[PDB]
């Protein structure tokens, strides 16, 4: 049975990568919220 998660590094970065988050105001707010929370891993870049 095919499951929901079909990994793809290229699609992973384009959808949730660091540059993608910086591309929009709302995405930049996501990083700001995560930085305020002190997240060790800001995004899924690596």
Q: In angstroms, what is the minimal distance from the CB of 38 to RNA?
A: 16
Q: Residue 12 CB: number of other CB atoms within 10 A?
A: 13
Q: In angstroms, what is the minimal distance from the CB of 9 to RNA?
A: 3
Torsion of CA 33, 34, 38, 41, to 10 degrees: -170
Which residues in 18-37 contact RNA (CB under 7 A)?
Answer: 23, 25
Q: In angstroms, what is the minimal distance from the CB of 3 to RNA?
A: 3
Task: Tell me which of 7, 36, 37, 40 binds RNA, using CB under 7 A.
Answer: 7
């Amino acid at each position: 049975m095919k499951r929901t998660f079909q990994p793809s590094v290229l699609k992973r970065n384009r959808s949730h990568g660091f540059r993608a988050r910086m591309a929009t105001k709302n995405g930049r707010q996501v990083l700001a919220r995560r930085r305020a929370k002190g997240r060790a891993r800001l995004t899924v870049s690596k």
